[PDB]
Amino acid sequence: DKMKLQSPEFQSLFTEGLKSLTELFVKENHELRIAGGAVRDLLNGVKPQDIDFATTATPTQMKEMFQSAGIRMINNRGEKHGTITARLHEENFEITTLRIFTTDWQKDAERRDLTINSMFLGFDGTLFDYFNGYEDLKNKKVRFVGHAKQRIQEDYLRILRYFRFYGRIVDKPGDHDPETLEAIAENAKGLAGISGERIWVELKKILVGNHVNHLIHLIYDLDVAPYIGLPANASLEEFDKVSKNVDGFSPKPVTLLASLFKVQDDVTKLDLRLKIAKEEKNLGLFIVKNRKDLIKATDSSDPLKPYQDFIIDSREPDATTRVCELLKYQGEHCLLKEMQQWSI
Amino acid sequence: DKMKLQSPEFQSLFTEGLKSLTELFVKENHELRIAGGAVRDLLNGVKPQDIDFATTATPTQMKEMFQSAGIRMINNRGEKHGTITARLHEENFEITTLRIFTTDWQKDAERRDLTINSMFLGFDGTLFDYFNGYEDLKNKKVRFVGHAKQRIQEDYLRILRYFRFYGRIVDKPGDHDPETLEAIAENAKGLAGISGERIWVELKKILVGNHVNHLIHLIYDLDVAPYIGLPANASLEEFDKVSKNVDGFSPKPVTLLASLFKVQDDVTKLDLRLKIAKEEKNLGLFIVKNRKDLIKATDSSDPLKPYQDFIIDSREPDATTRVCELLKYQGEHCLLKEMQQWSI
């Protein structure tokens, strides 16, 4: 309450237009702060990006305010509602009202995920905690705000979300409150019901994050795999392997997942449940043995030819890309570089 | 006798100076022909290069001929007398008289080792075979002239020479007349006597010719290795390996030999017997464990660094070269290419 935030990163959020936002939201009397990640990020130093603004004003009254000041709002099919986006100077501002529904007691945080994402930030730099979140972070904690019968509390997806953050912030691996880990195990069959493209977005974040190998093992030990698209478990040999192969290079989520794929089909099983996109699918079966094993790497005069040749004869797009991820997965580090300097 | 040899290659030997030679030798009445491999080469297409001319004139009268025509002679120091060398239009022509000692009945092709090399060639394009040689070649034969009772016939070196050509012409490995193969086994203890830098020049040819892996297995199966500087029957496991690693790239003879001898010292054992030069020696121990196993290749972020670094501060010459042959031997085909594009 006496310690205000002011570091350079935060300082710059105040763009040529955020100010105009502020101006407007003030004269019209409507407390507006920034929240969620985009508050913790700031605390951690990383500039927020895709900030999630929060406002006490109802969505109803925002338009009769933006329209008034002639501010273009963007992207419809609201369906939820709540959140709104203005443009201002060509910046875009995802403004969102608080909710139980549209409430107004900054105990919106109560609705929030985990501590870390339950903070608010005045533009003073006045930090609004409410759940020792600032303390959990820094402490590298990551804990929900209703035990874990908040995981079940609708959004069963929380499961994945837990895993995702344990990736952003942790340092060591294994340091898991048995409490929530259990909460997960017990539910999880719930996941079987939350959207599907809504898990893809998260599973992809888990995959291109930290201690993937760990996280996905959990995803199996706790038996979440089945309700998340993942195929037939137990072995996790190939995974671990490919896992240590792609690590460092910037593997595409499917490149990784593909390692826990026994066979093609065992991949459409994923396309059907996640509704992944094209390419996403195509890279999958591409890797999955149609080449995973047969397209080895020479062992004689001028390697990478077997690969290049493919790209040439391929008659199907991104041949290179597909190959490159293969090389990643296959672990051929040196060929990878060579290939990333080749053309036709 | 009616079929004269006529080809583009052969036609070109008649350089702007060979003619001068011909002129003289004809005006001095002394049948001069070209012989040895230079003849078989011509038959096979490859232009001779370092042709071995033969003359009925004694080495004595050659000088009282070249001196007369003010033609400079070179590469003296005995020059294994019988063989002389003039220059003519800056070209060098190794002329040699026939012998039992300085004889003259063109049955100097008795003293010759293998049929293939016992031919002669008139500037006519006439051949004169004498031992169905043109037929052994073309038939890919390679047989001594009159039982390996000739191998023993002095020049125990013939052993190595057999191997070397069996590599030139042959196609497949295995096709060995058991007769001569035995003759080798029986003798060969003899090699222990012939020169030593005289074998190194041949062992190297064997090493950078065709079916090496074979040839050397023979060089052991027939127990020749000991009387040649090669370490006491090792295992050839590593060999076979390294052999298939270097094949294709341009391995240096030592880079290969190093394989079949894996503790330093049995490398000097080679230096002592063959009187190989530095570098050859320095490459030896260099590969030979000096780095063979310890200098692996990364397995993480940007490989080849462990190699580069070595060179960067090796405080010893050719570091690169040495390294490069290692990569060959190590089998890192892709790091080899990369390394051959690097500098400082």
From Swiss-Prot, chains A, B:
Enzyme Commission number, as recorded: 2.7.7.72
Gene Ontology CC terms: cytosol; mitochondrial matrix; mitochondrion; nucleoplasm; nucleus
GO BP field: mitochondrial tRNA 3'-end processing; rescue of stalled ribosome; tRNA 3'-end processing; tRNA 3'-terminal CCA addition; tRNA surveillance
Substitution effect: residue 127 to S: In SIFD; loss of CCA tRNA nucleotidyltransferase activity; decreased stability
Record bears the keyword Acetylation: yes
A GO molecular function held by the record: tRNA binding
Binding-site residues for CTP, renumbered to this chain: 37, 40, 112, 155, 158, 161, 164
Binding site for ATP: 37, 40, 112, 155, 158, 161, 164
Consequence of changing residue 94 to D: In SIFD; uncertain significance
Keyword set, alphabetical order: Acetylation, ATP-binding, Cytoplasm, Disease variant, Disulfide bond, Magnesium, Metal-binding, Mitochondrion, Nucleotide-binding, Nucleotidyltransferase, Nucleus, Phosphoprotein, Retinitis pigmentosa, RNA-binding, Transferase, Transit peptide, tRNA processing
Swiss-Prot/TrEMBL cofactor(s): Mg(2+)
Site feature Involved in nucleotide selection, where: 154
First-listed, main subcellular location of the protein, grouped into a coarse class: mitochondrion
Keyword Nucleotide-binding: yes
Subcellular localization, as worded in the UniProt entry: Mitochondrion; Cytoplasm; Nucleus
Record's catalysed reaction(s): a tRNA precursor + 2 CTP + ATP = a tRNA with a 3' CCA end + 3 diphosphate; a tRNA with a 3' CCA end + 2 CTP + ATP = a tRNA with a 3' CCACCA end + 3 diphosphate
Site (May assist in discriminating ATP from CTP) location in chain: 113
Family membership noted in the UniProt record: Belongs to the tRNA nucleotidyltransferase/poly(A) polymerase family.
UniProt disease link: Sideroblastic anemia with B-cell immunodeficiency, periodic fevers, and developmental delay: An autosomal recessive disease characterized by severe sideroblastic anemia with onset in the neonatal period or infancy, recurrent periodic fevers without an infectious etiology, B-cell lymphopenia and hypogammaglobulinemia. Affected individuals show delayed psychomotor development with variable neurodegeneration. Additional variable features include sensorineural hearing loss, retinitis pigmentosa, nephrocalcinosis, and cardiomyopathy.
Name of the protein: CCA tRNA nucleotidyltransferase 1, mitochondrial
Species this protein is from: Homo sapiens
Span within the parent record: 30 to 383 of 434
